[PDB]
């Protein structure tokens, strides 16, 4: 656990806190976006929204580190939400959501349903005006039965010339079909068979329902490619959460956050991308801290929209060993711990901060540095010094000698 957080502009003054972060690493090039507010992280005024791609390099201690060469900031930070970043062939495509009515997860009924994609180059040139920053136009969003579609999640994958941003689809609740007998209420008694259906949107009576998935953005569609939404399979289905599909050891792995009653970690190898079928890992040791009704290690079908985003990166497939940062606490979102876990036991862990250090969304990406598996974990750690949120990175080397 080595701090490399100094390699991003996370360090501001004590009056600004860094929210809504992003980290998307692929083939040695990363991405990073964040929203600088003024004062509180909740009600503060947005200062700017950096969206900066770069490259992953090495120091003299064989420690991987980030280095932004190219940075783009939208003219209006207030209308850019839920950015997703996918690398593709020396360009780094960042897909976000344009909203003049606030966060469209919250104010979904009045959302314009408009997206924006911003091309950034991981190797910018001297005078590459349209080569470095070229925000593409998305005039055709193939939704299907879904009324609105979002890129919802930090990172996605590329399949040759095709992109797959983690997504979510705002399906109207009335037309959402779900057989209540499939609600797993057998093991525990305080769960009605109708909690699975109602907990599938942010409110039990929400007009829309969030259904996570992918956004097929094929570059071979011409000058104006279509954003095709790919819904996720209904097995072990819960509310649409910030997902993360990443190409690990050859086959994509789909992490999907536990923002509902299924508080256990919900990620697994992807059998097929279109349609999206994810073989969720039957994990029994890794969960996330839910606030009120669905705390850590909860599996009863319950109506809640709670939890935090703690992705896990698959670092070994022959043994299904993966790594990530998870908040080792039941209800309070604190104590970020970098754990390396199998499906049924935590192998080893490293506590990144103190016991009572408030933490938040953690984004863990792993890679190979000269055939050594390192991991960069962007952890939103609450600094008690300046009493604000700062995303702290942690270059962690996965050891081979135990």
């Amino acid at each position, epitope marked *: 656990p080595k701090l490399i957080s100094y390699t991003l502009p996370v360090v501001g003054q004590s009056g600004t806190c860094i929210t809504d972060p992003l980290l998307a690493m692929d083939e040695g090039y990363f991405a990073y976006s964040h929203l600088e507010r003024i004062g509180s992280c909740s009600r503060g005024v947005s200062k700017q929204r950096i969206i900066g791609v770069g490259e992953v390099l090495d120091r003299g201690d064989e420690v991987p580190s980030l280095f932004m060469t190219n940075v783009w900031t939208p003219p209006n930070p207030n209308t850019v939400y839920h950015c997703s970043a996918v690398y593709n062939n020396e360009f780094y495509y960042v897909l976000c959501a344009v909203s003049t009515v606030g966060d469209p997860i919250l104010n979904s009924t009045y959302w314009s349903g408009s997206l924006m994609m911003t091309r950034l180059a991981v190797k910018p040139k001297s005078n590459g005006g349209g080569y470095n920053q070229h925000q593409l136009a998305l005039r055709s969003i193939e939704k299907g039965r879904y009324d609105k579609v979002m890129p919802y999640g930090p990172s996605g994958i590329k399949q040759g010339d095709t992109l797959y941003f983690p997504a979510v689809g705002f399906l109207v609740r009335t037309e959402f079909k779900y057989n209540d007998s499939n609600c797993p209420i057998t093991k525990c008694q305080y769960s009605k068979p109708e909690n699975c259906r109602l907990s599938m949107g942010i409110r039990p009576n929400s007009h829309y329902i969030l259904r996570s998935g992918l956004l097929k953005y094929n570059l071979s569609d011409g000058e104006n490619p279509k954003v095709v939404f790919i819904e996720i399979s209904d097995q072990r289905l819960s509310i649409g959460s910030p997902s993360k599909i990443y190409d690990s050891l050859g086959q994509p792995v789909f992490y999907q956050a536990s923002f509902s009653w299924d508080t256990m970690i919900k990620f697994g190898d992807v059998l097929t991308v279109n349609p999206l079928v994810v073989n969720w890992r039957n994990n029994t040791v890794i969960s996330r801290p839910g606030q009120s009704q669905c705390p850590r290690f909860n599996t009863c079908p319950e109506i809640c929209w709670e939890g*935090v985003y703690n992705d896990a990166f698959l670092i070994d497939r022959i043994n299904w060993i993966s790594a990530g940062v998870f908040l080792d606490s039941n209800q309070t979102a604190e104590n970020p711990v970098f754990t390396v876990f199998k499906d049924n036991e935590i192998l080893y862990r490293a506590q990144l901060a103190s016991e009572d250090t408030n933490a938040q969304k953690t984004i863990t990406n792993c890679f190979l540095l000269k055939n050594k598996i390192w991991c960069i974990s962007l952890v939103e750690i609450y600094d*008690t010094g300046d009493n604000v949120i700062r995303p702290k990175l942690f270059a962690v080397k996965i050891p081979e000698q135990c």
Partner: antibody
Amino acid sequence: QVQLQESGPGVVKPSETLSLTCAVSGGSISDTYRWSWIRQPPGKGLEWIGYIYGSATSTYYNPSLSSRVTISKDMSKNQFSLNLNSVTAADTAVYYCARDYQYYYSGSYPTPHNWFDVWGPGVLVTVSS
Amino acid sequence: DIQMTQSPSSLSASVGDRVTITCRASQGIIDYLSWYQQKPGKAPKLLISTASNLESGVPSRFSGSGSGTEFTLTISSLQPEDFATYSCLQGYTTPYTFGQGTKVEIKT
């Protein structure tokens, strides 16, 4: 605007079921994601009891009162109740029913700021034989 | 649970004075704190949410600041209609624990 109104007997002997009722006027319990109960013993500070979703039947209760508190529901009369079992002299308080309010920012963060925007007028319930 | 301790328990100040009410949390809540004004015989009224927001209708003399463990309720220009019981409330986790209450008194 939603107006609440607690209702129940002001005299409850020790060691039986307290029975309150918070009638909801100006709004339906199908809205208002959570519905909480708060009491305040005389001479001490407010403490929280538990909430009911309204649209659902799921309850959470204060761990200091989890073994005793039962919160029921009624769509027909648009009211939700409270049932504190095995009341003692320490349960003398002013029981408020409140609309639990959640402030969601950045809906990739499902941890809202929870507070009570609408409170009932309250009712003094004294545990005496 | 998260113990919410206030200080002082009951203060006395004259009209127009600056009153600072502190509410200390056992665990670290980020900014999930709310301030309530409980007039005698009436239901508590929300003053400040997220520990720093002036709610609609609340006079500007009520200002809240602080985050983490120390939280502050500041009444800049105290008025005769501000002598009530002021309670902090944490929303970061459940059960929601109020403060023990602060009593404001006329210094005459």
